[PDB]
Design a protein around this ligand. Structure first.
Ligand SMILES: O=c1ccn([C@@H]2O[C@H](COP(=O)(O)OP(=O)(O)O[C@H]3O[C@H](CO)[C@@H](O)[C@H](O)[C@H]3F)[C@@H](O)[C@H]2O)c(=O)[nH]1
Ligand SMILES: O=c1ccn([C@@H]2O[C@H](COP(=O)(O)OP(=O)(O)O[C@H]3O[C@H](CO)[C@@H](O)[C@H](O)[C@H]3F)[C@@H](O)[C@H]2O)c(=O)[nH]1
Lengths: 450, 452
């Protein structure tokens, strides 16, 4: 029976999430409903396009709906709160209202597209209230939810002025999917603090008489397509650089420029490597790629400027006439080129302060030449650390521990690099993006609808 | 006869800078004494530290932490330095700083007095010691005393903002001879003096104010061209020889100075940005290296400009950098002067664009250091005192970042014939007015004065 996916952004006629949604839709046949974000004329029909099994369908938002829904409540209350940064939340009631109003707009426009024996799969924190809004319009359907980001423990979550409403609305889903067991446990603990919840099958619950199930589905990667892209011919100037850096090892990071990512702390870790391991001077380099994300907002502009300052400071202290220790690039690179960069790099530095999963970590390992692989240094606060147990796991709050991991990665024998890489690769191959989506859809299909 | 020189720092035998070679040439001809602050804080009780080699004696004292803060960090570097560099917005006048400034000048005069002899000629250097002739006169010293100001002297509209400008002018007139880097500095001093009090002037350079006789003169400081050429032609240290060879297909734009707000370093970085933006043919084929050792890092305005500069390095490299190409190499590090001559030689462009500079020896070093048969190009701010004499440089206005960018492009593509012609003309000017000439003229003029 049909699959209806809804997600805040979509891609028409790719990246980690899109390939999982596309696979679920290919097997079932369906429709992918979401925003096509450029505002300006909300009052037109849905922009519909069709392949064969599936139809994309998109809508626009007013500049008020966008400021209050996405720029304010999603990106400046939920995003900071869920990544353990209450000091960064910017709660204002007109923004909570706008959040509900937009979830209600989206539900009005989705109602007519739905059919009775459909299955519905909602994605991420922008749409916490969405199932509630569907139940109010009479849709009884199997609806599942997947949260891509962390779910915070009670002491953090309960600080949100509207936490009790958010919890009530989330129990309108039949299935709630999370990246890790601790996220699933945190949600249940928040729920248990507000109201009595009855459990009976490890993962089948009741609360306020509403029935639902929880489960862990750690999002994954397409390892064959990554390996293919990574292995392809370097564009000329990158072939030049690789043969120029024969004796220089490369430590590489890429991510969206976001405060969850701990980029300043990462620069400090590299500084500590340079400070305490002078053997490496002139023979390593750290390259951070960090394109500007949501630069319209103060917390993000603050980190960009801090990174500029820190690149300058660190290079100014440790640099030489013929050696720049830190390459900081505030630029977007194509996913395909990045896979090649991962392969040619010697160490992958993925140390966010808090991350739902972090695909870069999985991508980095998939892209390696398995005969000569690089080493993953990974933060224990990334959700990928629960499975990538053979990465060098570190606490980014201890810059010297991060530095010692980097030193160890830089000196690691081929035998140990193979052993560690092959162990992580086996794990990402077995829980691949195809596996992720199939597990969630099969669980969702099992639920008897109300 | 015997020369006594005082300056805020001195240099005992065991890395000789530009001013130091001038002073030493002076002292080696006359014999004499070099007296000044040791650079050390603490233990000011203990005797003067004296060393002697042949004809010369070096003598230093320590200062107390409070003396240093008020006299050096505050008044010298937070009032006089920003005011004389046309930065009223950075002056931090407070009365305790001024009293400290006078207290330290008096103290140095007290420590110097027992060491003087009747026939000594006395040469005082720089803005730290504006009151020093005055302190010497009230201690009964009748000797010929000359002053040289190494930095610009600002016009009345700026100088007169200093709450103590009047006392400064009165004290400067107790020198028998006052020397300046440029004619505009000399004139600005005289203009300030004429606005306070009636000055009688004969033949442009001989003056009376308040019944006190003194002379003024211009002595643009220079370099030792033959020593620089020797140093510059010497082999690079192996790691740097390797580097020069690896950069065959890369033109180097080079700059070096103290990390000071007078030097216009952010405006310079902005000019390089404009080069990279508007002249993309240079991408991957040029490099701009800025050497900028921290200077006076206890002073708030200096920490500010350092943080501003770091931000701009990161921003610019963040925007124009590539995986295999960093456009801007910023090094907050001191380099030995001898090594720098060699780096100037292998470089293709010298970028010296201060917002205000008494002279700027780096500009003169740069030209002297070039291979005259394959010379680099100097891009020079019209606001360095050096621009008065380095007329064949590519002269630019740093307030117009696109003009600086165009001069960098012009420098990067200049034919060998034009580079030789410009270089030879500049080199001739700096050979005819070298550091030996500078000190010999100052000393000759000072011996001429009839002591009170
Ligand atoms: O310049 C660039 C920069 C990045 N990329 C790609 O962006 C993706 C980054 O995904 P990643 O999961 O590591 O981080 P994230 O952006 O926070 O997404 C959230 O959602 C993810 C999905 O569940 C979850 O893993 C994560 O913890 C969430 F916070 C990854 O596929 C990169 O290759 C790129 O193509 N070019
Ligand atoms: O890392 C480094 C950085 C610099 N140097 C050397 O320091 C000297 C800088 O002298 P320069 O005259 O260019 O500037 P400045 O520091 O302001 O000195 C003042 O006084 C100078 C003398 O009258 C006058 O030209 C100037 O306008 C005044 F502001 C020059 O000889 C460089 O080669 C170095 O050896 N290592």
């Amino acid at each position: 029976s049909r699959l209806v996916v809804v997600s805040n952004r979509i891609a028409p006629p790719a990246g980690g999430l899109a390939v999982g949604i596309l696979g679920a839709l290919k097997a079932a046949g369906g429709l992918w409903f979401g925003w096509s974000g450029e505002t300006g004329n909300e009052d037109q029909p849905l922009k519909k396009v069709k392949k064969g099994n599936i139809t994309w369908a998109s809508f626009n938002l007013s500049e008020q709906d966008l400021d209050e829904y996405y720029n304010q409540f999603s990106n400046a209350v939920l995003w900071p709160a869920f990544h353990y940064r209450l000091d960064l939340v910017q709660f204002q009631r007109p923004a909570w209202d706008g959040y509900l109003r937009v979830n209600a707009l989206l539900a009005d426009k989705l109602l007519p597209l739905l059919q009775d024996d459909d299955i519905i799969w909602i994605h991420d924190y922008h749409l916490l209230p969405f199932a509630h809004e569907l139940r109010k319009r009479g849709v009884n359907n199997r609806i599942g939810f997947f949260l891509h980001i962390p779910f915070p423990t009670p002491e953090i979550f309960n600080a949100l002025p509207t936490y009790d409403t958010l919890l009530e609305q989330l129990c309108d889903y039949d299935l709630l999917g999370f990246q890790t067991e601790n996220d699933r446990l945190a949600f249940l603990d928040c729920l248990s603090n507000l109201t009595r919840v009855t459990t009976r099958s490890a993962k089948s619950h009741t609360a306020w008489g509403k029935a639902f199930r929880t489960e862990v589905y750690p999002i994954g990667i397409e390892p064959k397509e990554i390996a293919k892209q990574a292995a392809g011919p370097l564009p000329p100037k990158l072939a030049q650089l690789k043969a120029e850096l024969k004796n220089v090892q490369n430590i590489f990071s890429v991510e969206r420029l976001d405060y969850s990512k701990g980029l300043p702390e990462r620069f400090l870790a590299y500084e500590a490597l340079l400070e305490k391991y002078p053997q490496h001077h002139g023979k390593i380099r750290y390259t951070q790629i960090a394109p500007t994300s949501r630069g319209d907002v103060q917390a993000y502009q603050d980190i960009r400027h801090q990174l500029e300052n820190e690149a300058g400071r660190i290079n100014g202290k440790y640099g030489q006439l013929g050696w720049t220790p830190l390459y900081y690039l505030n630029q977007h690179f194509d996913r395909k080129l990045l896979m090649k960069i991962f392969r040619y790099s010697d160490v992958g530095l993925v140390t966010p302060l808090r991350d739902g999963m972090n695909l870069v970590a999985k991508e980095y390992v998939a892209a390696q030449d398995p005969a000569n692989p690089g080493v993953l240094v990974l933060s224990q606060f990334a959700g990928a650390a629960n499975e990538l147990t053979s990465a060098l796991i570190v606490n980014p709050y201890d810059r010297d521990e991060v530095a010692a991991a980097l030193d160890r990665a830089l000196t690691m024998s081929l035998a140990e690099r193979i052993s560690r890489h092959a162990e992580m690769l086996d794990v990402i191959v077995k829980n691949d993006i195809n596996h992720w989506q199939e597990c969630f859809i099969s669980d969702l299909k099992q639920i008897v609808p109300r």
